[PDB]
DNA sequence: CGCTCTGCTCCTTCTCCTTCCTCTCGATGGCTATGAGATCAACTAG
RNA sequence: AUCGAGAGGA
DNA sequence: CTAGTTGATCTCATATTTCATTCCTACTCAGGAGAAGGAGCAGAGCG
């Protein structure tokens, strides 16, 4: 119930200026805030403390803080994160990074 | 002159038209005090203007300075920025020659051009009784 | 000593090489870069069994450039010396304080101090080989060493070969 | 000039992987380090003249590699060795498939 | 898995972009050129080109979110954009 | 040299003493860093990375270009607490048998059996802390939950644990029966802890050990860490972290020194605060208690911490936005005569950005030419780099009209033509805001776009000023081109509605234009026809005839509009015969009512900008945009259009 | 052990001597591809033939380990190889103990267990015998 | 603050929506896995307008008088007329849309019937008519067969997933659930017969583009919607907003709390 | 029904906290002692 | 050269 | 291949006579919200 709520929420928000966004893009925010199984606020202390990993979250508010727990915990990252790689600077795995790209030596061999 | 940028006679900068003066004076320092430290600007051996004026003295504790001021022309060129007093505030767009703009049946031609929608959606009346 | 094993090799081909020609182009690119190798975990790479069967399962274009990786399997053939063995070998040099004898693809120096205590240098032979004791070690004589433990280094892998042992003795 | 956060936020969203890449590695910052795969830790000794590398306390002399990451990069981890944080970076992950 | 491939047969812009700009790398590095030239020097319209008869030697690797993939042969994908 | 890889995972934990000691290269023993020149070698010694002109950098050689320091050793003389691990120690020794070893509660407790099940590390040891710690006593024999009678000798101790606080870098505990915790004890405690306690604490067997959150070794960062500085006339002026390190050496030092010489406890007691308070400021030097660390100016010390937390730390000012190179920044100005895709780029930038072409075939003649121009003449290039990456320079040097260039080679070529080039106004608030154009050069300094493009800029020419970022590949060029094309943004997804329109006078104008009592003479349309570069040639027929050839407007208008195009909008008064003239009815790229305006030329969905997107692609709508902009505009400058007071007079 | 395959493959402990005769084979096989692009001096010769024309001659280190091997080995008729391999595999020998054995020279048990210090302590002596006069009646015929 | 919570969510090959951790935030993307840059404001004709009024705008009838069809309206005029056969086919297809008036005016309680989809059918529609300049003066060479034949043909080609499981068929089924029940609105046969005169030539070609038009506005895999979904709400902030500050942050404590009963 | 025990509710502490660019000014970065005497090594010449 | 304070524009 | 004088380097001496102090203007920002810890209380089980 309260998805939908939230939702009917921030679109008066929207509406009060007359500006119009699309449903799609208010529909994924309010899911992500009620995916962990409650209202997760955006905030340092809502969003921030989940399991994704440590350079993802320490980036945002808390830097050392966290960095000291994941030390603690000799927690892992699994270098997944879009902001874990550009720290590493790799292509992240997004857009033209979402897949990879091999020969194909077989038709090669037959192209000649 | 779309948005609030303006055109401007060319020929109206050739004849002066905001021509300004940019003065710019540069301080240098002889050296640090006596202790074991000398420096000197005897041409030693291995912007955009002209020199004004050189003016060499010593502050109280005697150390020599030197104050060069060099002088430049600043033409309007496209993209500098004027504004009326009334707030309405825009860049030179592009400048057209004397005979390529609008003219007068008496002759004149307008040194500046605006756009008219620089009014209605700011609501700058006065600038209109003032032209 | 000698195996059998499958070693995997990521190859790397230049773009300009991604013609018909690259999958033999790549096979001497691995024959020629695999033949005489060393490696601590295997010792020395001898040669490649089942040298057809190439296995390429296709190659990736690094995203910075063009160049394609391939993670190219092979059986090959490898010698791996360990502790406490019976080896026997031959000797390519000799040494006034030991050996520099030749175990297949392995050169094992033959310290003096691992020689039975009866064995002395001999200057005045011809090479200078030991003949003070019945284990006379020279270049054309044959010789039996024990590895007792392997030594690796960036060029290339050594071993100590032990003489003062009831077995292991010259020839 | 600065390439905000803002700003790759944008480059995020046009989905252009391989160019944020290169504003963050090939404008700025490029640099090649070693690495221990033991211990995924800069401490390899590179004696490039003599093509030579070792990691000091795994005395290895196989396992090296060389990772391309920004220099502000290094610079991090070596203040989070300074606070005796470990930050370990190994090139395979534990779960294969 | 070849067999039963759930991945749409429409060449995504994402791919198309990536394919483009690393056959336009491997052309300027004067990778051999599967099509007739016709004086357009440039390498990533000859890129296109080659894209446009399908005579790209590349084959996409889609990765699954469980970490396998399918093998996509430009071949067989479908570009329509 | 050696095998390139790329990350893919990065594990974090606690230095091991041991480990520690083991990757040092050098103890540090001396505060001292000199005597003129030359370095103590118990400090900053060339066993660490090498200042400049010394190729040594501990055996490393390579100069300090491409090879980093190595981190060195100090041997505290007394276990000091970390700073940022206090509150955890906290916890978890409140949670210890105190001198047992063992855990107060064991998996005998239901209590603890639902903790032990927990995944997630840390919330388990968060629920332990918070059952454990009212535990106040580790009693030896626990009374089995299957059978009452029976007990569990368990706790080692047996005694009670007391309460213990939070004292500044010190921690108290009152006793139920009260002293300050010594720092020894906790590592007596710690190596006690049973390998099974750590999982059940959630620290790792051989990455995060407890004893390890206690400091008895220091690694010292190498100078990269913090740089020789020459700020003034040979001055040094060292990084905090020199001279804060150094303060550490002479705690440290005295330290080793009262316990040797007579060993006066109460003395050493206070050195022990100096020697943990030091450590601690330069952990952090931002702490709960008071004391704050003061450089000698006065300047509270940067610690560690100060270079992370916040904006302008190594995080955010450093790594997740970055200062880059290949951009160049000025004032934008419009230009009718210009299409979306293009820009206006001054010579004087395309004269000094540069794009690394390469040589082959296709290009080697193009590029043998702009290396002969040089680095002045705008189409030229700046460099030329030969395979061994000799960079030769042709500004200083006359080898531009010497050079035969090789395949391989790379050109630094100025930016030309069609060369793609990404915008980016400050604040990038949304995708629009940053878009990839074609580059026209122009002989002025400021950049020029076409008009419609404010508008997802959100730019204005009042003095605005804009951003540019060259692509440094001829792959990076393809993702941009093919990806943040201007054209391809033409539909926004924030809202469905095109983001781009016509604006401004051309939509002034273009509502004068297609009136019904518009009427153009035959010389003025031959005109208007050969600025629509679209125009086939035809001359369509004239509307009146006989009397005069008299074009309409909306006839003229329609000559840009493509072919094939088929639009129908109908307000309360369009009856197929609009008295009223509104409304909006084409038919193959022929106008046939309404007038033209923001209702269809506009941003909204159904204008006449949204339809041709879907019908011919956006490649073809970008060009409607300049053809329907150069078409009123001529007309426009040719009837003219202006305001004045009297129009407000009513 | 496992090989790349992703087969559990025990470890391959090839004798000296059947080691030998795998490389001629994988040097025959190397010959064939290249076209269609016994005694110890009998042994000896063929083998710098087909590692001559396997490669260009600058692998001399491993020239020089072929003949030093085919110098030591103990069985080469590739037939009566085939006998010594089920003489210690079939007795459930380690392959690891088994190499040495099919590619060193003993007679006697003790000796062996003299050799191999793992033999020592867990060895049936009497295979060893049985086996030992056997191959070694088969060493002399080489 | 918005854009770090969405920064890493993408939509993955399966068109699911799923953040770093592979968690699942949305099964398809928007619930419909169309991308948001082929959308546009269309009228739903089945919702509104009086139960008669709908009716006589979509029953056809071979046998009786009030729906008749108009013989000159096809080719074959009294051939069709009094068929059974095709018939039960008016019947089917027509209780398909009274179940579709009635579901629709079930999700959309206001009865509003404009809402955002993919493929503005009308200008399809409009353009195929030009397109050969379609002649309104003569009889069709369609025939009721080959219009409700197309219309369900049409349907199980629109394909957003790929999946032959019974699980995602069934999902499959769903999220082309709302387009279809418009499809079907406006392209029934009555309108496609007296409204819109097509000829085969004109309806095949139709059909053709809907299925092309549609799948190139499924949304791509790749795609990084959180962040693009964040700026999008971002851009319209900064143009109540207390209100704003006051959800993003939950902060318990509200400023306006009320209630509205009914 | 008091005793005791425990958890529940309440009531005070106890913390932490914000796009890009351009210029000028200016303070500042800091404290540490004398060379002499004697012996060994380094350079040159026979 | 670095910090700090300031004066702005987009 | 040694010995010559002279630069380089190590060690210490006299050591004066020698620093803790002058506080000080001054004062309001800006508060909100969330975690954490203790304290008291009321009721449930126990004696
Ligand atoms: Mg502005
Ligand atoms: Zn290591
Ligand atoms: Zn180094
Ligand atoms: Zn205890």
Request: with cysteine.
């Amino acid at each position: 119930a309260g998805r939908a709520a939230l939702y009917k929420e921030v679109y008066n928000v929207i509406a009060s200026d007359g500006s119009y966004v699309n449903y799609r893009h208010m529909a994924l925010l309010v899911d992500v805030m009620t995916t962990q199984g409650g209202l997760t606020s955006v905030t340092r202390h809502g969003f921030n403390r989940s399991n994704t990993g440590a350079l993802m979250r320490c980036s945002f508010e808390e830097t050392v803080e966290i960095l000291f727990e994941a030390g603690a915990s000799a927690e892992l990252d699994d270098c997944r994160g879009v902001s874990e790689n550009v720290i590493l600077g790799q292509m992240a795995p997004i857009g033209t990074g979402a897949f990879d790209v091999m020969i194909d030596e077989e038709s090669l061999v037959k192209y000649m | 002159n779309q948005e609030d940028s303006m055109i401007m006679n060319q020929s109206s900068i050739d004849r002066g038209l905001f021509r300004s003066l940019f003065f710019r004076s540069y301080m240098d320092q002889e050296k640090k005090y006596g202790m074991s430290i000398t420096e000197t600007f005897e041409k030693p051996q291995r912007e955009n203007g002209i020199v004004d004026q050189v003016l060499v003295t010593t502050n109280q504790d005697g150390l020599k300075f030197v104050k060069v001021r060099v002088r430049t022309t600043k033409i309007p060129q496209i993209g500098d920025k004027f504004a009326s007093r009334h707030g309405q505030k825009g860049t030179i767009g592009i400048t057209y020659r004397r005979e390529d703009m609008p003219f007068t049946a008496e002759g004149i031609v307008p040194d500046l051009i605006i756009n008219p929608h620089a009014i209605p959606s700011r609501m700058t009346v006065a600038h209109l009784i003032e032209c | 000593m000698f195996f059998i094993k499958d070693l995997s090799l990521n190859i790397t081909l230049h773009p300009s090489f991604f013609g018909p020609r690259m999958k033999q182009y790549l096979k001497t690119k691995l024959l020629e870069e695999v033949e005489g190798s060393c490696t601590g975990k295997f010792g020395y790479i001898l040669c490649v069994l089942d040298y057809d069967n190439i296995d390429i399962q296709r190659g990736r274009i690094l995203p910075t450039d063009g160049s394609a990786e391939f993670n190219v399997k092979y059986r090959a053939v490898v010698f791996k010396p360990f502790k406490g063995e019976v080896v026997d070998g031959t000797v390519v040099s000799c040494s006034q304080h030991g050996f520099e004898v030749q175990v297949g693809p392995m050169k094992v120096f033959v310290t003096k101090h691992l020689m039975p205590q009866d064995l002395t240098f001999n200057a005045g032979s011809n090479p200078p080989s030991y003949q003070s004791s019945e284990d006379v070690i020279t270049i054309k004589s044959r010789i039996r060493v024990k590895i007792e433990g392997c030594i690796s280094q960036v060029s290339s892998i050594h071993a100590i070969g032990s003489i003062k042992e009831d077995y292991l003795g010259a020839i | 000039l600065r390439f905000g956060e803002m700003e790759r936020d944008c480059m995020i969203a046009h989905g252009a992987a391989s160019f944020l890449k290169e504003r963050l590695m090939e404008a700025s910052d490029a640099f090649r380090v070693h690495i221990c795969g033991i211990c995924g830790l800069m401490t390899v000794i590179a004696k490039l003249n003599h093509n030579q590398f070792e990691c000091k306390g795994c005395d290895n002399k196989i396992d090296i590699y060389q990772i391309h990451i920004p220099y502000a990069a290094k610079l991090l981890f070596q203040e989070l060795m300074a606070m005796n944080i470990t930050p370990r970076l190994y090139t395979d992950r534990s779960r294969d498939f | 898995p070849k067999d039963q491939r759930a991945t749409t047969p429409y060449m995504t812009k994402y791919e198309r972009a990536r394919i483009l700009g690393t056959r336009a790398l491997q052309i300027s590095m004067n990778a051999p050129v599967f099509v007739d030239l016709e004086g357009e020097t440039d390498p990533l319209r000859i890129a296109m080109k080659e894209l446009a008869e399908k005579k790209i030697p590349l084959v996409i690797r889609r990765y699954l979110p469980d970490g396998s993939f399918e093998d996509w042969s430009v071949e067989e994908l479908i570009v329509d954009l | 040299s050696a095998p390139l890889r790329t990350v893919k995972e990065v594990q974090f934990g606690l230095f091991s003493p041991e480990e520690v000691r083991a990757i040092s290269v050098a103890k540090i023993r001396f505060p001292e860093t000199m005597q003129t020149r030359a370095k103590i070698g118990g400090l900053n010694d060339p066993r660490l990375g090498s200042i400049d002109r010394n190729l040594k950098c501990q055996t490393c050689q390579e100069g300090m270009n491409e090879c980093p320091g190595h981190f060195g050793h100090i041997d505290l003389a007394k276990p000091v607490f970390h700073v940022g691990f206090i509150a955890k120690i906290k916890k978890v020794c409140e949670c210890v048998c105190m001198h047992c070893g063992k855990l107060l509660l064991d998996e005998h407790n239901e209590l603890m059996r639902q903790a032990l099940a927990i995944k997630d590390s840390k919330k388990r040891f968060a629920a332990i802390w918070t059952l454990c710690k009212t535990k106040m006593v580790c009693e030896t024999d626990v009374p089995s939950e299957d059978d009452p009678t029976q007990l569990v000798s368990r706790g080692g101790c047996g005694n009670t644990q007391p309460t213990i606080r939070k004292d500044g870098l010190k921690l108290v505990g009152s006793w139920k029966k009260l002293r300050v915790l010594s720092t020894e004890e906790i590592l007596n405690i710690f190596k006690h802890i049973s390998v099974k306690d750590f999982t059940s604490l959630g620290f790792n067997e051989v990455f995060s050990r407890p004893e390890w959150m206690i400091l008895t070794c220091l690694p010292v960062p190498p100078p990269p860490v913090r740089p020789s500085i020459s700020f003034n006339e040979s001055q040094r002026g060292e990084d905090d972290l020199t001279f804060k390190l150094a303060d550490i050496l002479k705690a440290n030092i005295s330290l080793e020194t009262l316990e040797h010489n007579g060993a006066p406890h109460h003395a050493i007691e206070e050195a022990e605060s100096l020697l943990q308070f030091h450590v601690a400021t330069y952990m952090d030097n931002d702490i709960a208690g008071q004391p704050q660390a003061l450089q000698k100016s006065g300047r509270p010390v940067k610690s560690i911490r100060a270079r992370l937390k916040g904006k302008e730390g190594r995080i955010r000012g450093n790594l997740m936005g970055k200062r880059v190179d290949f951009s160049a920044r000025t004032v934008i100005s419009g230009d009718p005569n210009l299409e979306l895709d293009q820009v206006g780029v001054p010579k004087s930038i395309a004269k000094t950005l540069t794009y690394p072409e390469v040589v082959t075939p296709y290009n080697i003649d193009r590029l043998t030419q702009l290396v002969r121009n040089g680095p002045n003449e705008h189409p030229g290039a700046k460099y030329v780099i030969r395979d061994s990456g000799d960079r030769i320079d042709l500004r200083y040097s006359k080898r531009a009209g010497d050079i035969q260039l090789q395949y391989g080679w790379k050109v630094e070529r100025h930016i030309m033509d069609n060369d793609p080039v990404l915008f980016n106004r400050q604040p990038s608030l949304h995708k629009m805001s940053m878009m990839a154009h074609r580059v026209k050069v122009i002989p002025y300094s400021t950049f020029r776009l076409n008009l419609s493009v404010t508008s997802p800029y959100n730019a204005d020419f009042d003095g605005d000023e804009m951003n540019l970022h060259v692509p440094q590949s001829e792959e990076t060029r393809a993702e941009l081109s093919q990806l943040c094309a201007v054209p391809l943004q033409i539909v926004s997804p924030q809202s469905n509605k095109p983001c781009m329109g016509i604006v401004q006078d051309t939509l002034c104008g273009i509502r004068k234009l297609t009136l019904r009592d518009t009427f153009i003479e035959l010389d003025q349309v031959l005109n208007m026809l050969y600025w629509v570069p679209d125009w086939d040639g035809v001359i369509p027929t004239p509307a009146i005839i006989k009397p005069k050839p008299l074009w309409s407007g909306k006839q003229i208008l329609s000559v840009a509009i493509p072919n094939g195009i088929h639009l129908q909008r109908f307000d309360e008064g369009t009856t197929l015969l609009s008295p009223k003239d509104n409304g909006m009815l084409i038919i193959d790229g022929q106008i046939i009512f309404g007038v033209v305006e923001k209702k269809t030329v506009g941003s909204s969905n159904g204008g006449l900008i949204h339809v041709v997107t879907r019908e011919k692609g956006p490649q073809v709508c970008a060009k409607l945009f300049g053809n329907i902009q150069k078409v009123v505009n001529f007309w426009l400058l040719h009837n003219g259009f202006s305001t004045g007071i009297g129009d407000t007079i009513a | 052990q496992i090989n790349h395959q992703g087969e559990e493959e025990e470890l391959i402990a090839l004798n000296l001597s059947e080691a030998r005769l795998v490389i001629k084979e994988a040097l025959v096989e190397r010959r064939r591809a290249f076209k269609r692009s016994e005694t110890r001096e009998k042994e000896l010769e063929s083998i710098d033939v087909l590692l001559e024309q396997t490669t260009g001659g600058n692998n001399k280190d491993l020239k020089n380990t072929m003949q030093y091997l085919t110098n030591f080995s103990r069985f080469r008729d590739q037939e009566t190889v085939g006998a010594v391999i089920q003489l210690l595999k079939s007795t459930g020998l380690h392959p690891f103990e088994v190499a040495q054995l099919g590619s060193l020279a003993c007679d006697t048990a003790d000796e062996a267990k003299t050799l191999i210090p793992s033999l020592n302590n867990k060895i049936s002596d009497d295979e060893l015998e049985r086996i030992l006069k056997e191959l070694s009646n088969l060493e002399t015929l080489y | 603050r918005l854009v770090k919570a969405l920064e890493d969510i993408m939509v993955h090959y399966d068109n699911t929506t799923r953040n770093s951790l592979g968690n699942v935030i949305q099964f398809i993307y928007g619930e419909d896995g169309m991308d948001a840059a082929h959308i546009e404001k269309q009228s739903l004709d089945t919702i509104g307008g009086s139960d008669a009024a709908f009716e006589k705008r979509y029953r056809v009838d071979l046998l009786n008088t009030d729906h008749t069809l108009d013989p000159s309206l096809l080719e074959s005029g009294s051939e069709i007329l009094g068929d059974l056969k095709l018939q039960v086919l008016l019947d089917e297809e027509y209780k398909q849309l009274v179940k579709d008036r009635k579901f629709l005016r079930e999700v959309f309680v206001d009865g509003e019937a404009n809402w955002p989809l993919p493929v503005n059918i009308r200008r399809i529609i409009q353009n195929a008519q030009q397109t050969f300049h379609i002649d309104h003066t003569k009889p069709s060479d369609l025939t009721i067969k080959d219009i409700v034949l197309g219309v369900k043909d049409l349907q199980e080609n629109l394909l957003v997933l790929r999946g032959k499981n019974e699980i995602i068929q069934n999902a499959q089924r769903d999220a082309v659930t709302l387009f279809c029940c418009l499809l079907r609105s406006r392209l029934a046969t009555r309108r496609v017969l007296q409204e819109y005169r097509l000829t085969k030539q004109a309806f095949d070609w139709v059909l053709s583009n809907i299925e092309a038009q549609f799948l190139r506005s499924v949304v791509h895999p790749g795609e990084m919607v959180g962040v693009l979904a964040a700026q999008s709400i971002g851009e319209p902030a900064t143009q109540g907003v207390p209100r704003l500050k006051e959800i993003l942050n939950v902060a318990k404590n509200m400023k306006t709390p009320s209630l509205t009963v009914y």
